[model samples]
Target chain A: TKPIWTRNPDDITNEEYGEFYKSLTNDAEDHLAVKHFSVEGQLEFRALLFVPRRAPNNIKLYVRRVFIMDNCEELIPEYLNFIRGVVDSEDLPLNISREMLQQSKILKVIRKNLVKKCLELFTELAEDKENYKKFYEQFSKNIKLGIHEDSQNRKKLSELLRYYTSASGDEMVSLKDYCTRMKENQKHIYYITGETKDQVANSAFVERLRKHGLEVIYMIEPIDEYCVQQLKEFEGKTLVSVTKEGLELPEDEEEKKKQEEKKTKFENLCKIMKDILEKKVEKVVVSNRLVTSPCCIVTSTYGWTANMERIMAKKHLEINPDHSIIETLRQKAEADKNDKSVKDLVILLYETALLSSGFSLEDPQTHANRIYRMIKLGLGIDE
Target chain B: KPIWTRNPDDITNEEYGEFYKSLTNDAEDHLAVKHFSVEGQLEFRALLFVPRRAPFKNNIKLYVRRVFIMDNCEELIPEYLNFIRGVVDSEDLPLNISREMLQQSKILKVIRKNLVKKCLELFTELAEDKENYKKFYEQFSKNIKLGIHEDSQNRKKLSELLRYYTSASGDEMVSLKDYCTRMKENQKHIYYITGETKDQVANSAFVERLRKHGLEVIYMIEPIDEYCVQQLKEFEGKTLVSVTKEGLELPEDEEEKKKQEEKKTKFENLCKIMKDILEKKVEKVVVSNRLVTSPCCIVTSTYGWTANMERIMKAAKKHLEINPDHSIIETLRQKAEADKNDKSVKDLVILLYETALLSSGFSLEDPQTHANRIYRMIKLGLGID
Candidate 1:
């Protein structure tokens, strides 16, 4: 069959896409998403891209219907390795080394256009709710990965993200959805991360946000947090973790006064916990956000999330532990130096805080004993 | 010379070893070697070896049309098999081919699969010889674990070649096959422990209790071991259980079981007192079955990180696992009950935890604080203060 990419994109049929994909990849499964387009500029090319049901088939490169190379990474950018397709360029010379072809200005334009087309295909896929959800479930991480690596199309990629927001009711919601429904006085888009959807939904970090009728996006995947970190802002609203330091919520003077009073009430308690914990925590303060949970641990706006910290720790262990990354590890020794009563209390608070925020503890058995001690003190049990 | 059709008998071990060193420019001997010719779809000759350690650079040399075309053809082996050092010469491959062309070639894919199969087979052959394989494993076990992580297709084969130092062998290494061979008659799981050093592992109360039993516990001292065990959960029908993890069960005689139950009941008051004194320092104080000679040791839940792993991860700035089993916590309750207002009891509880932390291969947050407590204990012991 003549190449489907050679025909106009509108003239292409579903069967044609399937036939081209089968021949291009030899995989029997129909492509999850397909983009067929032609480019005309400094470099003229016709291209077809497919998001395979499974990763990692390569994009074949052709020059004027002559098979150039399939493994030429220059056919598509590094981040689009998931997209399997063929790009046939009309301008590139047939007798050229792979290196020279990749370095050529025409090939570079073709590569850039192919990436743009792939992301646009995703944006088009997202318009259909069910189809986009299925597509997002499979390749959301790959797109998030693109955001981290591809700065040129980051804003376009950011618009394509479909998250499980608090208000979405199990449906995938876009940043635009959150922005449309955002409170009149809301300044930033809020999000929270946990090991799973349920964990993030039930986190103590979200208590106040939920009470205020504010919606928080649930970031369940490890890469989701990193994606948001790189995305930084979408459509002028800064992406903020509900647990981040300096997160400002809308409050009137009366509500602010009540919050101040509560802070003062907890000031002595915070001081006592901080004295015991020492440098284990950067600082302890009365959390304006906590409702039912006694306390939760949060990092500075720029500091690593407990999840990011967990990942960094594993990487350091496997790669090189002697690096300065180890020097920045959370130190428990300083906290252990306090008077026994204070030290023990600090350890309990630290463990409790870790648990309340969906983080695992450093010492489970010790935390267990602390829990028992508290129980005995309350119940008046005697030896 | 026709690139790589050398006879099996004609090639001496020293020559193959020498070729490996020459190919890699590494002074160390190749730990294992195999020379084989593939049949069927792709015909090629390969001389593959497990290097003493992963090389600073990829050491694969490719020859086709009797001319050296490329070295370090990544397609030849997966990243996990990067430790494999060797040369593959193929008569079927085209000469003067672009790197992209060689990579996309259908023949190259078949050869890569055949090469990986041969390399893994060489490792299996090496692993069968217990002692020599131990020396090889001590050097390149990380590479095998990397295979288990990166190459799922070869994971089962790579896992079978995996070895660790077990309680039965002490400093000598043993494969999982050897570990399963020596498991107690009633043993249902493969027990293991992770630490920074062998000494730290041997001295751990976690190990002491497991060692007291006739069951063998694998000592995983490397940083990668924890992750490997996490990935390679069950081997040969036995689940891998960390002794430092919670929910460790021991087989006790009927009388010992009765004794344990009664002891738990008897120590209820004492447990409550200790729990109160320790406050949040412990999850709960309880009469422990995992303790043999030790007064107390810290253990975490099945999913929680070990003390040694925790230390490593913390150094890497990662937080893992939390303490407290409200359902099972008791002893600390008794300690607090015994002396609700006594500061000295609090001091003793803190000291116990400090020592426990040190014994578990974790450095105290404040060594001076431990020192001060030691000094205070000595002064009180001498009746001087």
Candidate 2:
């Protein structure tokens, strides 16, 4: 029988896709999604892309209708390795080593066009809302990762980004929804980062935003915030964390002056907290945002968010020591201080911040004692 | 036609246990053994077991019309209840369907529900016999606790199957129901403390008052037991209170209560002194009514982690109650408050809480500091300083 790629996608049935998938990858389940398209640019190629229900390591590669190699990285990016399919290009020399084929400019063009068609297929499905919801359940992480790793198409990829916003209830909303629904004159897209939807929703950072009826996108899953970070500015709007320092809520001249005054009012409190916390925090300042929580620890604009730090620490084990959050707290006890009271206050604030930021303490026993001290004081046992 | 028929009485208990071992290729004895037929919902025969340990992988086998269809079927039971090993031979399910299609069958759902219900019933029967239940519990209590957490429909029934070391029973185990049945008439809460072993729990300063009042305190020895109790929250409408928590109320006469109030008044300066010197070492240093023979012990707040749980959490790299009215702690409180910044008072309180940690079966975070404090205490006590 003539190979399936010779036919147009219009003529191909869904069953044919399954038959073709089994022919190439020996996968038993129907593909979560598939793309069949031909490129007509600098290097001509026809490709069929399939997103598998399970993560796979390699996708088969063919040159000029001849099977060339199975271990092809250029066929798709490493992040999209779970994809399985075939890329057939007409202009490539058939007989060559993998090294020679990988270095070929013709192969690079095929890869570029294949990735484009694959993403376009995803975009088409994503536009359908219902189909994307099912598609995302299987390959949401893969696209999130493409946002993080791919730079040239970052903008287009971000348009495909969907997140669970507080206003959306349980359904995911696109970045376009955020843009269209943003309050007039709002400067930045706001988000809070945590390990899960529940944690991010319950975060102290979300409290004021919720009260003001401002919907903030939740970057809850592990790689989500990193993806947002890589996408820096989406559709001309900057991504801002409510917890981060530069969060500027739109305000009038009168409110702006009162805001500055409030900063001055809490200036000593900041310095005192900063000194007691020492290097555990970059610096403490009166939160313009907090209304309910007494305090929360925030990261510097360029520094890693607590969630990112946690993920990196867990994955790499030996993350950059200079950037280590644990390194800062570990240094707190050895700072040549004989005064136990200030040190105790320092530890208390540090531990409190750790808890409020959705982090478990490195030294839980120390946290226990601090909690014990607070309880004693509250119960008037030391009077 | 020759048909497979079975007799439950023909099989010896040892024969059943051994037969299960051969069926599963496991070395451990079956924690529970049940052979039964279901008549309601759907008709089937099931030979099931609760294994002594969790299987490394899903191992439940499914059969239909006396023919083997598949093993390790995820749809047969939920993951938490996967430790149950069995075969469900159904008469209604078609014998010709593909294994994957069988997973989606309406009959499979009905079979799964019945299997779980029957498995839980078998466990309930096992729990009725004290010796057999204790043997089963010793081998698979973690699995039972997991079932309690996961099986919402069967949580109450599985909870009754729980067994723990109680102060009244010493090394032997007592059920939550048994503990509640023996609860003192005026006791409104069921109290428990977690520790590594029975001796550690029975000897803890936190348990002294409960023992003195002849109140039964459940001893949670397994690390998972604490997590289970935390999730269970309460049994039979009585709140499960940690005896080591701050709010434990011992039944004291008015004279004793007045005496305790006066002792607190007398020791107020000492309490403040210990609070100041200990600073961050302890939350507070108060006289404890819970201690009789011990000098002092650490206690956490009402919602704080127990010392045993704290130890467990520390081991995984995650992560007390006290009466402040005891005479010995009062003496140290006086010594501490009298000399506000004295090294001896600081050392004494540090050593007291540190030793309390050990007496309560927890390891010290800063053992060197504990050792140095002990050395200083030795030097002072021998009149060398």
Candidate 3:
């Protein structure tokens, strides 16, 4: 009997093709989303692909209307390993060795066409947002993974990517939608990665961004930080982490003038503290990212974020000079630079910030010792 | 022919699911099942089941020539595979009485070896599909670890079946083979630390310098884990080294070694204070190469029990290795140098040694004395007179 895929691409109905997909995979007795497309010009082959509803009988390869192999990884990328079906090609040998199949020029062109067709199918599926929502829910991680794994198609996959916005309770917002709603002065696509949805939404990291009424992408999945790291940019705006130090925010000239004035005022304070901090931090700078938080630890532009540090299982520390701790410490430095009580206070503040921001202290007992001193001085039991 | 022995080529997975449920007298609570033959020396047909959860429901029915001989045969397999359910049928052995269990112990040994090999082979095959294999591993990982200890003949084979959460693996588990493949160019050993959980091992004072140098150390979380790996000495030519043990020489340039050598001589006075203070409790105090971020740690000799193993054995004399890099150590050093016979210096030295002992996972013989010292430190540290 002739295979279903060998027929013309547009001729077969979804019902007929889905039935064939159902027969091969036997997955999901419910309605299966199947796409049958025949590439004629470059790679002469007909392929039927389904977005798996999982991976066992994934993308079976048939050389001319007969089964040659199942999961011929050469025919599709691992990101597309979810696509299930047969690629019937009359262009090659019936019994092909894996070595020969991978090396074949025709198979390479077939993969190219298969990749384009599956992505195009996704593009079409994305038109119906409700159905695309289903597809997104099922294979969002794979699509996010594709953004990192497939270099040439990274931006194409980016446009298909969707995430929960800081504003959108738990609903997904596409990059395309987020870009359209971008504030006129917004330069970078602000995103924050975290362990949970609620964690990032209410995070001190997102506090400043929320005050501006700017929506930050809530990349709650573990792969998300790695995904954004690869995707790098969207449209013309670069993807940036708000938790990052040296983060630029669109601000008035008045705010910049005030920032510099505060920076100058805090310079000596930062110096005294940096001397105390020594190896614990790279820099103790004024924080533009902070709104109300006393202090927060942030990484440099090149280093891993608190979320990323947690992801990779690895922090640079940043301090907000605008905060009260900065002022109190500065006041103490002015009065007596080496006040024994204030010296303990500075180490206390640095370790306090480290704890407040998921940073690992080198020695907890060092922190513990200072804690007892702080308790005693405040209590004044001896006095 | 028995249902298992016959080809049953058209058999549905559902049928096997039903048969397993009927055999086990429970809802089909298995992750997967294998029907295999133990070939060569003792040819026997066996059905092995990897359960969804680990428990000792090991129901092995031994059939001699397709006739039932005994059910729940303990001698048929190793203790590690006690979670594995199903049956073993042999055509060669004659079915008999009480002596059948004792007399057939020689032949039983062959069958058991082959059965263990068969189960491991099934695991090896199952591992190809990582998701399903991960399911089996989560359930039977401890068993495989125990198997490495029980079956010395297949120890190397069983060692390969081990998986662990490493310092670098984040939240995922990596096989020893993966760790070996990722070993650094000059890295001499497969490094690991033993503790109660992944977080504990990751944050342990033992692996601080290991992590500081970006070295990956496997986390042996279960009590049996380090003990199991101890039986199987080395993995693929790289000696498995415990980060908790003394004599750990990390790969470092000569300059670093020279730097450490200089610090050793300089910190002798502090070491003397620690040694004198902890005289009866510890072996000796020395400057450490293993500590970078940690102030101090208690390490055992390679021949003795680990902090984890000792908890099981109630364990030994240990080295009080101090980190010269830490600020607390210098303060302790100067304090010891400042007043050799002062009560405060002696108290500080005692508290320092005990904190190291506590952090390095040693249970203090008398914790109340340790608490009393900390109370005194709190009073003096705060000037809370």
Candidate 4:
């Protein structure tokens, strides 16, 4: 087998690599969407890698004339698990121990050279969003997985992962794309996850984010919670979940502290809420997440947010503690902590929080009773 | 580098560590290391190492008669155990075996099956020593989980090797067998609920009655955790079931059953009225034996997909269940009895279904309508006359 790398870089054709990929993959020659390139100086090797239209477990490694081995771990990586290729190195021995071959310092140089070329091929494909869109929809998960598992290459792959954002309708945007569109004074990457765009659009987490004129990334499944959630930041800005306990909006520090102290005012009511609902929701904290509604829930800073992604939540009962409802309930609780009407009012607000935040009522009949309590109150009915 | 060929008695621990560090090319950070001569099936020696940190990569180099045949020999170690790195030197295998030719060999199946057991046994030995297994466990927890998912023959064995958080674990994780050993009497099923993490499952409505009953519930706290448990299906003859899914089972108390039936019979008109008012909102309304003190909850049909799973792929219709003994429900039963068609009763019925949707972990489609109704209640009843 004459080496393909011996040919001049520009002289080699896609059809040659096409035939080579077809021989290796046994699929359509054109569809590996194959590329042939070679490297020099620090290390030298001729490589052919492809976007296999489907997937692959291993790559082929050939040393000069004879086909030496096909299985490669040092050649490619797990994040690029779907990447299929054939690398022919002239410098390697004809009959080499694969155990020795993979661990060899020279092959690692070849891998670096080879990995760089494949990425160049990716950049070429990404020049047209339409072509890149198809490529992205196919291997975006692998690319995102690369961001988590491949630390050295994570930042580069960050550009490779894309999503539907609040600003873009039906179009995908990247972190770079999101950064360029970041709201004035916005200093973090924001995202909200759900099953779909329509579903997440109404999410209570999105309410404050949108209200602040921020661009929110919509992470839909089966994109996975593990890969992206662990991605702490991209390009200097922190990547924060709107639903979890983080905030980026400009704060009036003194006013914010005043409000924080006012969590004291609702502390008695908040304690009653914890006393009543700790079996379901452990922590009751004050929140600005609910500006329109009275209150809502959240998974802790590290809550099982797979619910948000699968979309999942140990959750907190975040009272828009400043809401008129909480303020009213606060007065009632202080007046009489043991009063039935005040306790009912407190429980009712939590139920209202659950309903408003798109949560399921754990106790439906009790929620129904509270609704009826207000129905009788609304109508002044004596039953 | 057929390190396994050396006398077992002669090779020192430091030498094994050196061979491991050489094979994986690291500075001796192996969490667990093993070297074993294959017994009972075929003749082979394996020196394997579990890396201190997971890299989402794995390798098991296979050799025939001290000749390097290949690395990542899939037939030797299954897909899930790919994080394992080492060399499998087989005295029995032919040197010229092509990858395709080896797959056709019935002998390789024996080698593979035995090799998997060795790898599993290696993990078993690692579990007992120091707390190093936790380091190993944390590193390749997904690998073991994926093993249960990918290897059917060894799933039961692999399942036992798994560790999880419990409603009772507080922070320490437990295995299925550990949970089974400490299971309370009267709890027949191995209960679990899958979510993104432990805290969420601990905070879920599904576990309220579970914790109150002093029963242990395992937390399958990741999306991958869920897929693995779904395949596990059972452990130690007990069915592994999700708490979020419909069809809850508990030790039957005849008096409780009697109390439940009496409530259902008593609240039939209220249930019917509420069901009729929110027709499309629910499949039906039933008085719940599952409810302890909570007024209402939404449960899936017995064989249907769970509420948490709805967004994943199930259009499983939801059923609303209410507690009859609860005061709010007791109040509704009387109010609806006066006139099931009363405006106050119907609006309240709608609010109940909407709130139950949220509390039960389902999304409210028409949230504005829910807000309008909630505001109506709040304006009327919030510290007012």
Number of the top-ranking candidate, with lDDT as the measure: 3
lDDT of 3 by residue, B1-385 (tens): 6667765365567776677777776665567777877667777788777777766424788898788888778877877888777878886775674654643677787878777877888888887777887888887887887778877888898887788888778778878899988778878888988877676667777787877887889988888886786787798998888888888888857788898989999999889877887777788899988876566788988887778887665536698898898766776787678888877667766766776765677654443344345445544544444
DockQ of 2: 0.01
Number of clashes found in candidate 3:
0
- lDDT, residue B72, model 1: 73
Measured by DockQ, the strongest candidate is 4
Off by over 4 Å in 3: A8-11, A54-57, A63-67, A93-96, A305-315, A375-383, B1-385
| lDDT (tens digit, per residue) of candidate 2 on A1-383 | 55677687788999889887877777888887888888776667788888776655466777777988887886678777877788788787778688886688887777777778778888888879897887787777878888888997777788888899988889999989988888776778899876667767766676667877778998877777767778788778888887576577765688678777867654544555466665665666656565544455666777666666654421101111122222232343345444564456445545555556645455444444454443333223442
Between the candidate structures 1 and 4, which one is better when assessed by TM-score? 4
lDDT of 4 by residue, B45-153 (tens): 7777777877762478887778888876677767787777888788777777876887687778877776788788888887775387788788888989988888788
Clashes of each: 41, 16, 0, 29
The stretch of ten residues in a row with the least summed lDDT in candidate 2 chain A is: A314-323
Write the residue-wise lDDT of candidate 4 on A10-100 in tens digits: 7767777677667767775455365677776656677777787664356788876467887777787777767777778878878778799
Please tell me the interface RMSD, in Å, for model 4.
6.0
RMSD of each: 14.2, 16.8, 20.1, 13.0
Name the candidate, 2 or 3, with the larger TM-score value. 3
Most accurate candidate by TM-score: 4
Which sections of candidate 4 miss by over 4 Å?
A: A1-5, A222-224, A251-283, A302-316, A347-383, B1-347, B354-379, B383-385
Q: How much is the lDDT of residue B297 in candidate 4?
A: 74
Q: How would you encode candidate 1's per-residue C-alpha lDDT over B18-88 as one tens digit per residue?
A: 77767777787777888888766677788788776645445688888557878878888777777777788
Please tell me which model should have the higher DockQ, number 2 or number 4: 4
Off by over 4 Å in 2: A53-58, A308-351, A360-383, B1-385
Measured against the true two-chain complex, the DockQ scores of the candidates, in the order shown, are 0.01, 0.01, 0.01, 0.13
